[PDB]
Write an enzyme that holds these catalytic residues in place. Structure first.
Site, PDB file in Angstrom:
ATOM      1  N   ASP A  54     -12.110   9.970  -7.865  1.00 57.76           N
ATOM      2  CA  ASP A  54     -13.315  10.474  -7.244  1.00 57.76           C
ATOM      3  C   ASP A  54     -13.026  11.615  -6.296  1.00 57.76           C
ATOM      4  OD1 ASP A  54     -12.375   9.296  -4.801  1.00 57.76           O
ATOM      5  OD2 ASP A  54     -14.332   8.393  -4.486  1.00 57.76           O
ATOM      6  N   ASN A  85      -7.494   9.926  -5.395  1.00 58.51           N
ATOM      7  CA  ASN A  85      -8.246   9.080  -6.321  1.00 58.51           C
ATOM      8  C   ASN A  85      -9.032   9.916  -7.282  1.00 58.51           C
ATOM      9  OD1 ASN A  85      -8.402   7.420  -3.371  1.00 58.51           O
ATOM     10  ND2 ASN A  85      -7.367   6.544  -5.131  1.00 58.51           N
ATOM     11  N   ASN A 108      -8.722   5.501   3.260  1.00 63.79           N
ATOM     12  CA  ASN A 108      -9.532   6.409   2.408  1.00 63.79           C
ATOM     13  C   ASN A 108     -10.367   7.509   3.068  1.00 63.79           C
ATOM     14  OD1 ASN A 108     -12.125   6.898   0.438  1.00 63.79           O
ATOM     15  ND2 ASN A 108     -10.243   6.825  -0.756  1.00 63.79           N
ATOM     16  N   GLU A 124       0.822  -1.211   0.000  1.00 65.83           N
ATOM     17  CA  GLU A 124       0.000   0.000   0.000  1.00 65.83           C
ATOM     18  C   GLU A 124       0.861   1.268   0.000  1.00 65.83           C
ATOM     19  OE1 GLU A 124      -3.032   0.435  -0.632  1.00 65.83           O
ATOM     20  OE2 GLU A 124      -3.952  -1.479  -0.230  1.00 65.83           O
ATOM     21  N   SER A 150     -11.328  11.543  -3.506  1.00 69.08           N
ATOM     22  CA  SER A 150     -10.983  11.202  -2.151  1.00 69.08           C
ATOM     23  C   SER A 150      -9.442  11.052  -2.170  1.00 69.08           C
ATOM     24  CB  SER A 150     -11.675   9.934  -1.745  1.00 69.08           C
ATOM     25  OG  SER A 150     -11.128   8.894  -2.529  1.00 69.08           O
ATOM     26  N   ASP A 193      -6.028   8.746  -0.173  1.00 74.45           N
ATOM     27  CA  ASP A 193      -5.605   7.627   0.682  1.00 74.45           C
ATOM     28  C   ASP A 193      -4.414   8.086   1.515  1.00 74.45           C
ATOM     29  OD1 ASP A 193      -7.509   6.102  -0.753  1.00 74.45           O
ATOM     30  OD2 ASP A 193      -5.873   5.014  -1.778  1.00 74.45           O
TER      31      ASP A 193
END
Length: 129
Positions: free
Chosen positions: A48, A46, A59, A35, A50, A52
């Protein structure tokens, strides 16, 4: 902070992740590797909108507040920046809520694609736990 493999395994262990919800320690270590490459300051945005955050790439759409994800839930009740700290406590606490959500570790795409079904125990091999 960029953790070492065994250093990370030990902190995760101390924080109660080993076998948490049936997921062995190597699972958590493998996920962290893929990750974020073990870096607590890792961030990724991301499509969208959002973002991480942290070692587990948690998220902003559900889990933490970053002030810029409209219609975000803040399930872990923390600011996303708390997930970038050298002290992995909030991230772990938050990960525990996430893995308890019903899809287990499948919530982490890198886990499903790169750890799931592999010999994860290799991840803790040689460590003094």
């Amino acid at each position: 902070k960029v953790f070492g493999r065994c250093e990370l395994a030990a902190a995760m262990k101390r924080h109660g992740l080993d076998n948490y919800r049936g997921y062995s320690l190597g699972n958590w270590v493998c996920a962290a590797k893929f990750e974020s490459n073990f870096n607590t300051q890792a961030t990724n945005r991301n499509t969208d909108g959002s973002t991480d955050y942290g070692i587990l790439q948690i998220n902003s759409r559900w889990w933490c507040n970053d002030g810029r994800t409209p219609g975000s839930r803040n399930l872990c009740n923390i600011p996303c920046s708390a997930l970038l700290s050298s002290d992995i406590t909030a991230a772990v606490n938050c990960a525990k809520k996430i893995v308890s959500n019903g899809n287990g570790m499948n919530a982490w795409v890198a886990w499903r694609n790169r750890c799931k079904g592999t010999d994860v125990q290799a991840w803790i091999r040689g460590c003094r736990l």
